[PDB]
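In response to a reviewer's request, we include the raw inputs and outputs for one of the modeled complexes. The two entities were modeled together in a single run.
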Amino acid sequence: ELPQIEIVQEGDNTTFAKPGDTVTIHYDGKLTNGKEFDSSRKRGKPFTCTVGVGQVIKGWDISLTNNYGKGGANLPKISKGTKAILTIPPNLAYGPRGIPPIIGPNETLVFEVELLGVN
Amino acid sequence: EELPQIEIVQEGDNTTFAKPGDTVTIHYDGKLTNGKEFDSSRKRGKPFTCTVGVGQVIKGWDISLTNNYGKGGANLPKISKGTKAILTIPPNLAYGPRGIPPIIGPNETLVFEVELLGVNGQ
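The model returned the following structure tokens for the whole complex.
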């Protein structure tokens, strides 16, 4: 149903991504065991995508858009400049199948995310 | 960005519009370009209710019903409550290069006749 969000750093709290908005982020992808599958920084650029439109895993879409603007209980809003940890259950990520050998079947994913800008 | 082809057969209220995360109720008939029907609300015997804009249905439906997630599109008319439309959905907005055989074949364009009966229950 819903991902888990923890706020490392608060952001302006006025600019929020909306579905179909563009966002730019820095991120860390780790499995629960602490081993890293993807990272923007090591790639060498921040990552820009369209959120809320199924262009990224559902857990990102929910987190970045605050559940498509509906919101949820215990879903803190994420705003420009926010730094957070996102814990995403497999159905909000790559599912029962996974994407082997990159990500195994039924994996929860932990993301360190910083929202640099919206649109 | 691919967009579905939407034709307004009959205008609706022009006031009630679904947004992402809204619920909608619709009557629909789905046919292949050769005119063969593959799915219908009538065959179900009830209209179909779902959440739009969240990847719960094929992308073509999500775009059509939310007017590209509230962004709009070139030549993309808005669909409002009471609208009857025909939606032509290219394979990448439906089921893909693969398909879901035998229900729907590979690389298939889908043509839907839709009526939007309600938004969020009303």
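As requested, we also summarize the result in words. The helical segments of chain B are 41-44, 59-66. Chain B is about 10% helix and 35% strand.
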